[PDB]
Design a protein around this ligand. Structure first.
Ligand SMILES: O=C(Nc1nc2cc3c(cc2[nH]1)OC(F)(F)O3)c1csc(NC(=O)c2ccccc2OC(F)(F)F)n1
Ligand SMILES: O=C(Nc1nc2cc3c(cc2[nH]1)OC(F)(F)O3)c1csc(NC(=O)c2ccccc2OC(F)(F)F)n1
Ligand SMILES: CCCCCCCCO[C@H]1O[C@H](CO)[C@@H](O)[C@@H](O)[C@H]1O
Ligand SMILES: CCCCCCCCO[C@H]1O[C@H](CO)[C@@H](O)[C@@H](O)[C@H]1O
Ligand SMILES: [Cl-]
Ligand SMILES: [Cl-]
Ligand code: NA
Ligand code: NA
Ligand code: NA
Ligand code: NA
Lengths: 290, 289
C-alpha cells in the first residue's frame, strides 16, 4: 500500500507522457479514483511544477483537465488530476486504425476549440497528437480533453500580447510524425504550427497511417524529407477537399498570425451537415461502457 | 451500415484472437446487454467453430465456463455468440507491472485448479493452459475466473466407460511452449497431468515476473532450458507448496486421475498460515467492473 499527500492511494501505471509517468490511485477520503502524475525529483530538468501552473491557468476551460492537488513529497513531485477516459490513439487502435468521416469531424471540431482556448491563455501546446487527446468519463464522455503541457510555452506576453520573436536553429520539440514543415526546418513554433499538427492527426485518422510513418534508419532526416516532399493533394487524395484546404491554410499562415479558428471549424461543420450526419456524439467506439 | 448477425446481435470492433478465428464485441439489442462474438470463415482450411461450440454446449452450467448464446452461419462466416467476459490474467498481470502478490496467485490457483478439474470431469484436456486463456468475469461475476479457447482441446476419455485414450509418442507440440509440460516436449500424448503442470508454470510465472526459459534467442532452446532448470531452482525464494505442486504433477503417470483436492489444499493451508482472508480482493482491485 502506497499513500501520497496523506489522502491518495497509489495504484499502477496507466500512462507515460513527455515527462513523468501517470498512475491510477484513489482519493481515499472522497471515495473516487484519480490520475496521479509523478515525476522523480532527481531528474536533470524538473517540470511537473511548471506544468502544474500551466494547468491552473487553463482551469475551467471546456475539456481542460481539473487539477485536484499539487505538491512535492520526498522523491516525487506529484500532481493529482481528474481521471479521464482513454486517448484517441487507444480508441483509434480499438477501432482497428480507422475512423469514419463522422468521428473524424466530431473530433476535429473539438480539437480545434481546445487548441484555440490554449492560444487565448497565451500558450502554444507544441505536441498536438492522438495520445494528448482524451475522452472524459461518464457525464463528460462525449468531450475531448487535452493533456501534457510539458512542452508547451508562451508564444506572447500576457500583458501586451507582443508576439515572441521569429528565429531559427531550434531543436526538434514534439513528435516527429506530426510536426509542422517549419519545425522540421528549425523555425520557432507558433500557433499555426499547433493547428498544422492537428491537420496531420486528422489525416492520420483517415489514412490509418501517414506516408512518412514507419521508415527504417540506423537519423529522422528521412521523416522530414518525405513530409516536406509529399504534395498535400496526394496525402489527402480520396478524402474530402476540406482536409487539403485546412492543411494548405495552416501551411500558408505566417509566423505571428492569429489563425482564423472559426473558418477552419467552418470547413468541417459545413462538410459535416452536407454529408447528412447527426450531431449526436455517437462516435465509432460507441458500444463501450465509458 | 448497421449489421445484425442472427437477428439479435449487433457486430462491433475486434477485441480478441485465440488459437483460431477472431472475437468481436457485439450487443444483444433485445436484452440491452453486451456479448462477445466469435467468427470463423466457412471456407477455412481447418474448420473448428462448430467443434468448439459443442465443447462449450456440453460444458455449459460449469462454474467459470462462458455461456453459449447463439450459433449459426452468416455470409462467409460461422458465428458463435458468447457471454461477454472481462480481461485475461495476462492483461491484468501486465497492468500490475508483471507482479502478482502471493494472495492473488493463491486466490487465482484455487479457482484455476477447479476449472481444469471441471474440464477433466467433462472428459477433455485443454492443452493450452496459460494466462491469456483465463479471464475474469464482468459485473456480478468479477470474482470468477473463467477459462476459454478449446480449439486445441481433446477428448482424453470415453464419457460412457471412462476408458483412457492410449499412450502415444512422437507427437508434435500442441499449445504454448513457455508453459508446456516436460513430457509434452518429449512428444508424449497429453493427459490431465499436463494441464496441471502447465498451470504450475503459470503460477510460478505469476510469482517471478517471467519464467527462466523465456526471452531466449529453434524453440529447441526453450525445451532444453526447461530440463536444466530443476524445480528447486525455479521455485527458490517462494513457499514450498509451489515446488510440491510441480513435483507432484511431474510424478503423475499418463492416465492417472490427479488428486485436485490435495493440490488445492496445499495452497488453501498456506493461504491461512499467511493469515489472508478468502475475500476475493485481487491486486487489481482499483479497477471497476
Ligand atoms: O489514460 C487514461 N486516463 C487518464 N490518463 C490521464 C493522463 C493525465 C491526466 C488524467 C488522465 N486520465 O491528467 C494528466 F494531465 F495528469 O495526465 C485511461 C482511462 S481508460 C484508458 N485506456 C484504455 O481503456 C485502453 C488502454 C490501452 C488500450 C486500449 C484501451 O481501451 C480503450 F481505450 F480503447 F477503450 N486510459
Ligand atoms: O477479451 C475480452 N473479452 C472476451 N474475450 C473472450 C473470448 C471468448 C469469449 C468471450 C470473451 N470475452 O467466448 C469465447 F469462448 F468464444 O472466447 C476482454 C474484456 S476486457 C479486455 N481487455 C482489457 O480490459 C485490457 C486490454 C489491454 C490491456 C489491459 C486490459 O485490462 C485491464 F488493463 F483493463 F485490466 N478483454
Ligand atoms: C469489451 C471490452 C473492451 C476491451 C477492448 C480491448 C481491445 C484491445 O485488445 C485487443 O484489441 C487489439 C486491437 O486494439 C487486437 O490486437 C486484439 O487481438 C486484442 O489485442
Ligand atoms: C485506469 C483505467 C485502466 C486503464 C489501463 C490501461 C492499460 C494499458 O495502458 C497502460 O498500461 C500499461 C500496462 O498496463 C502501462 O505500462 C502504461 O505504459 C500504459 O500503456
Ligand atoms: Cl513568416
Ligand atoms: Cl465557429
Ligand atoms: Na502527461
Ligand atoms: Na466538424
Ligand atoms: Na478464442
Ligand atoms: Na488457495
Amino acid at each position: 500500500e502506497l499513500r501520497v499527500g496523506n489522502r491518495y492511494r497509489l495504484g499502477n501505471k496507466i500512462g507515460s507522457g513527455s515527462f513523468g509517468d501517470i498512475y491510477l490511485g484513489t482519493d481515499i477520503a472522497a471515495g473516487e479514483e484519480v490520475a496521479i502524475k509523478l515525476e522523480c525529483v532527481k531528474t536533470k530538468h524538473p517540470q511537473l511544477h511548471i506544468e502544474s501552473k500551466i494547468y491552473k491557468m487553463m482551469q475551467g476551460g471546456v475539456g481542460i483537465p481539473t487539477i485536484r492537488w499539487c505538491g512535492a513529497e520526498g522523491d516525487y513531485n506529484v500532481m493529482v488530476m481528474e481521471l479521464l477516459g482513454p486517448s484517441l490513439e487507444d480508441l483509434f487502435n480499438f477501432c482497428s486504425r480507422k475512423f469514419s468521416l463522422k468521428t473524424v469531424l466530431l473530433l476535429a471540431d473539438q480539437m480545434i476549440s481546445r487548441i484555440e482556448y490554449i492560444h487565448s491563455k497565451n500558450f502554444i501546446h507544441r505536441d498536438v497528437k492522438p495520445d494528448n487527446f482524451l475522452m472524459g468519463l461518464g457525464k463528460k464522455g462525449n468531450l475531448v480533453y487535452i493533456i501534457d503541457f510539458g512542452l508547451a510555452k508562451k508564444y506572447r506576453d500576457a500583458r501586451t500580447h507582443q508576439h515572441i520573436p521569429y528565429r531559427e536553429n531550434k531543436n526538434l520539440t514534439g513528435t516527429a510524425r506530426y510536426a509542422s514543415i517549419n519545425t522540421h526546418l528549425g523555425i520557432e513554433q507558433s500557433r499555426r504550427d499547433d493547428l498544422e499538427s492537428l491537420g496531420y492527426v486528422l489525416m492520420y485518422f483517415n489514412l490509418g497511417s501517414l506516408p512518412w510513418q514507419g521508415l527504417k534508419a540506423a537519423k529522422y532526416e528521412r521523416i522530414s524529407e518525405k513530409k516536406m516532399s509529399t504534395p498535400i493533394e496526394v496525402l489527402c487524395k480520396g478524402y474530402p477537399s476540406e482536409f487539403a484546404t485546412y492543411l494548405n491554410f495552416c501551411r500558408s499562415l505566417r509566423f505571428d498570425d492569429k489563425p482564423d479558428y472559426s473558418y477552419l471549424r467552418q470547413l468541417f461543420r459545413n462538410l459535416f451537415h452536407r454529408q447528412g450526419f447527426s450531431y449526436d456524439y455517437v462516435f465509432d467506439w460507441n458500444m463501450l461502457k465509458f
